[PDB]
Design a protein around this ligand. Structure first.
Ligand SMILES: *[C@@H]1O[C@H](CO)[C@@H](O[C@@H]2O[C@H](CO)[C@@H](O[C@H]3O[C@H](CO)[C@@H](O[C@@H]4O[C@H](CO)[C@@H](O[C@H]5O[C@H](CO)[C@@H](O[C@@H]6O[C@H](CO)[C@@H](O)[C@H](O)[C@@H]6O)[C@H](O)[C@@H]5O)[C@H](O)[C@@H]4O)[C@H](O)[C@@H]3O)[C@H](O)[C@H]2NC(C)=O)[C@H](O)[C@H]1NC(C)=O
Ligand SMILES: *[C@@H]1O[C@H](CO)[C@@H](O[C@@H]2O[C@H](CO)[C@@H](O[C@@H]3O[C@H](CO[C@@H]4O[C@H](CO)[C@@H](O)[C@H](O)[C@@H]4O)[C@@H](O[C@H]4O[C@H](CO)[C@@H](O)[C@H](O)[C@@H]4O)[C@H](O)[C@@H]3O)[C@H](O)[C@H]2NC(C)=O)[C@H](O)[C@H]1NC(C)=O
Ligand SMILES: *[C@@H]1O[C@H](CO)[C@@H](O[C@@H]2O[C@H](CO)[C@@H](O)[C@H](O)[C@H]2NC(C)=O)[C@H](O)[C@H]1NC(C)=O
Ligand SMILES: O[C@@H]1[C@@H](O)[C@@H](O)CO[C@H]1O
Ligand SMILES: [Fe+3]
Ligand SMILES: [Zn+2]
Ligand SMILES: [Zn+2]
Length: 341
C-alpha cells in the first residue's frame, strides 16, 4: 500500500536496491529488468512503481502516460538561500570530450572517427550529439557517421556496437545496463580514457568526477584534466574548465517517473526515504547512502545532493522543455504519435 516497488536496471542496481530495501524495512521493494525500457513497461503494468530516468527515456515514458515526480538536484553556487528539496534544478551540460594528445580532432572532422556514447536514447550520449550530426549532415544515416562506436542498445552486430566489451566474461556485449563495461556517463568516459574511442559524449560533471584523483578506480587513478579537451560547435577546442562556453546543450536533470495514479504516493515515500538516507540523512554515512555507489551511478547519479520537488506541476513536455522535445522529435523521424509499447 504505502510500500513502493523500485525498478532496478541490471544486476548491480538490483544489488543496491536489495540493500536499500533491507534498510528501509520493506518500505521500498525491488523489481529487476535488463533494460530501462523494460523497467518502463514494468511500471505501466503496475508491477513496479518508480525508477529514476534520463531526459531521453522520460520522453519515451511520457508518451506512455508516465509523469515526472521529483528531479535530481546537484549542489550549486547560485540559489543558496533555498533548501535543496525546494531549489530549482539547473540541469547539466552535454559536452563532447577528446584526448588532448589527439591534435586537430575538432567538431568538424568527427566523421569516420570512433565514438563512445552513454547509451542509445539518452540525452548527452545520443539524442543531443546525433540530433546535431543528423541536422548538419542532412541525412538519417547516423549509423554510418562514425566508423565504430560503443552505443549500448544498438544492434550488437552493427558498427554501433563494435567498440563495446560486455562484462568480465565478454557476455552481454552492448546491453544498455551497467554490465556493459562502457555503459553510462562513466562507461563512455572510460571508453575514451582507454583510447577505445576518439570521442565520448557525456556531461560536464563526468570529466571532473573521474580525473585528478577523484575516482581511485584503476582506469581513472592516473587521469588528469589537462589531458582532455572539449569540442565546441564553433570548430574550437577548449579546456574542461570552459564547459560553460563550450557545450552541445543544457540537458534537463534525470528524474524519478511513475504512473500518474501513483505519483502522489511515490513522492511521499521518497521524501521520507531521502530524509533517512540522502545526503545528510539520519542513517547515511553510518548505515546506507542512497546517492553513493563508488562512481557507478546506480539508481541515482552519485553527485545528487537531494531529490527536488518540481513546482508548476509540470507534464513531461513542460519538464523536458520545448527545445529538447522538438530535438528528440526531429531525430525520431529518422528511425506516428503513440506509446512505443
Ligand atoms: C562541471 O562539473 C563540475 C563537477 O560537478 C563542477 O564543479 C563542482 O562545482 C561545485 C560548485 O558549483 C564545487 O564546489 C563545491 O565544493 C567545494 C570544495 O572546494 C566546497 O567549498 C565551498 O563551499 C561553500 C558552501 O557551499 C561555498 O560557499 C558558497 O557561498 C559563497 C558566498 O560567498 C559564494 O561565493 C560566490 O560564488 C560565485 C559563483 O561561483 C563567485 O563568482 C563569487 O566570487 C563568490 O565567491 C558561492 O555561493 C559559494 O559556493 C564556497 O564558495 C566553496 O565552494 C563547496 O561545498 C562547493 O559546493 C565542486 O567542488 C566541483 N566539483 C569538483 C569535483 O571539482 C563545475 O562547476 C561544472 N562546471 C560547469 C560550467 O557547469
Ligand atoms: C535539428 O533541426 C530541427 C529542424 O529545424 C530543429 O528543430 C527546430 O527547432 C526550432 C528551435 O527550437 C523550432 O523553432 C520554433 O521556434 C518557435 C519560436 O520559439 C520561441 O521562443 C520564444 C522565446 O523568445 C518564445 O517566447 C516563443 O513562445 C517560442 O517558443 C516556436 O513557436 C512557434 O511555433 C508555433 C506553432 O504554431 C507558431 O504559431 C509560433 O508563431 C512560433 O513560430 C516553436 O515551438 C519552435 O520551437 C522548430 O520548430 C524546429 N523545426 C522543425 C522543422 O520542427 C532541431 O532543434 C535540431 N535538432 C537539434 C538537436 O538541434
Ligand atoms: C516505513 O514506513 C512507515 C510508514 O510511513 C514508517 O513508520 C511510520 O512512522 C511515522 C512517523 O515517523 C508514523 O506516523 C507512521 O504511522 C509509521 N507508519 C506505520 C503505520 O508503521 C517507517 O519509518 C518506515 N521505515 C523506514 C526505515 O523507512
Ligand atoms: O533542459 C531544460 C533546460 O531549459 C535547462 O536549462 C533546465 O532544464 C530544462 O528545463
Ligand atoms: Fe543523462
Ligand atoms: Zn548553451
Ligand atoms: Zn503546466
Amino acid at each position: 500500500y504505502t510500500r513502493v516497488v523500485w525498478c532496478a536496471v541490471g544486476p548491480e542496481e538490483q544489488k543496491k536496491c536489495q540493500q536499500w530495501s533491507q534498510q528501509s524495512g520493506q518500505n521500498v521493494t525491488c523489481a529487476t529488468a535488463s533494460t530501462t525500457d523494460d523497467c518502463i513497461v514494468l511500471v505501466l503494468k503496475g508491477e513496479a512503481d518508480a525508477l529514476n530516468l534520463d531526459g531521453g527515456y522520460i520522453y519515451t515514458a511520457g508518451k506512455c502516460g508516465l509523469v515526472p515526480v521529483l528531479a535530481e538536484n546537484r549542489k550549486s553556487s547560485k540559489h543558496s538561500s533555498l533548501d535543496c528539496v525546494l531549489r530549482p534544478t539547473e540541469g547539466y551540460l552535454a559536452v563532447a570530450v577528446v584526448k588532448k594528445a589527439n591534435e586537430g580532432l575538432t567538431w568538424n572532422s568527427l566523421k569516420d572517427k570512433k565514438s563512445c556514447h552513454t547509451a542509445v536514447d539518452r540525452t548527452a550520449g545520443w539524442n543531443i550529439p546525433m540530433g546535431l550530426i543528423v541536422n548538419q549532415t542532412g541525412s538519417c544515416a547516423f549509423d554510418e557517421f562514425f566508423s565504430q562506436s560503443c552505443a549500448p542498445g544498438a544492434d550488437p552486430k552493427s558498427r554501433l556496437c563494435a567498440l563495446c566489451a560486455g562484462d568480465d566474461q565478454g557476455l552481454d556485449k552492448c546491453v544498455p545496463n551497467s554490465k556493459e563495461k562502457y555503459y553510462g556517463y562513466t562507461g563512455a568516459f572510460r571508453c575514451l580514457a582507454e583510447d577505445v574511442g576518439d570521442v565520448a559524449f557525456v556531461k560536464n560533471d563526468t570529466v571532473w568526477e573521474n580525473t585528478n584523483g577523484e575516482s581511485t578506480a584503476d582506469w581513472a587513478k592516473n587521469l588528469k584534466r589537462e589531458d582532455f579537451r572539449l569540442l565546441c560547435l564553433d570548430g574550437t577546442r577548449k579546456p574542461v574548465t570552459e564547459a560553460q562556453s563550450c557545450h552541445l546543450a543544457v540537458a534537463p536533470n534525470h528524474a524519478v517517473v511513475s504512473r500518474s495514479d501513483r505519483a502522489a504516493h511515490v513522492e511521499q515515500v521518497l521524501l521520507h526515504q531521502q530524509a533517512l538516507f540522502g545526503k545528510n540523512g539520519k542513517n547515511c554515512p553510518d548505515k546506507f547512502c542512497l546517492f553513493k555507489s563508488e562512481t557507478k551511478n546506480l539508481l541515482f547519479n552519485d553527485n545528487t545532493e537531494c531529490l527536488a520537488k518540481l513546482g508548476g506541476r509540470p507534464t513531461y513536455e513542460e519538464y523536458l522543455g520545448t527545445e529538447y522535445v522538438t530535438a528528440i522529435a526531429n531525430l525520431k523521424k529518422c528511425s506516428l504519435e503513440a506509446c512505443a509499447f
